[PDB]
Amino acid sequence: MGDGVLELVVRGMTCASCVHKIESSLTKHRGILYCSVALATNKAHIKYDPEIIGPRDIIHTIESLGFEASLVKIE
Numbered sequence: 001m002g003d004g005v006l007e008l009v010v011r012g013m014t015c016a017s018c019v020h021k022i023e024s025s026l027t028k029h030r031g032i033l034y035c036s037v038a039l040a041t042n043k044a045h046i047k048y049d050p051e052i053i054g055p056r057d058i059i060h061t062i063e064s065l066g067f068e069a070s071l072v073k074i075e
Contacts, residue, residue, distance in 0.1 A: 003033055003047060003048065004048050004049055004055075005046075005047055005073070006044070006046040006047065006048055006058070006071055006073065007043050007046075007071065007072050007073050007075060008044040008058075008059060008062060008069040008070060008072070009043050009075060010037065010042055010043060010067045010068075010069050011067060011070065013039060013042050015039065016039075018037075018066055018067070020037075021065060022035065022037045022062060022065060022067075023035045025061065026044075026058055029053055029061070031052040031053025032047075032053065032058065033048055034046065035047075055071055
């Protein structure tokens with residue numbers, strides 16, 4: 001409920017694959033509330049609370065997995 005939206009533009013990606021890699025991966029952090037990786041806009045719309053997980057924590061994990069990841073925040 002009004003927790004924290006987090007559009008990371010994920011510079012990299014391709015088609016599928018990278019998508020569910022991100023989604024499946026970061027959802028393992030029990031502070032990610034949701035992970036919509038809009039390939040269409042090369043963007044992880046993550047939903048998270050800042051309290052139990054920092055945005056950088058997720059970002060590190062994303063960039064590490066395949067990418068560069070920048071919290072544009074609704075782009």
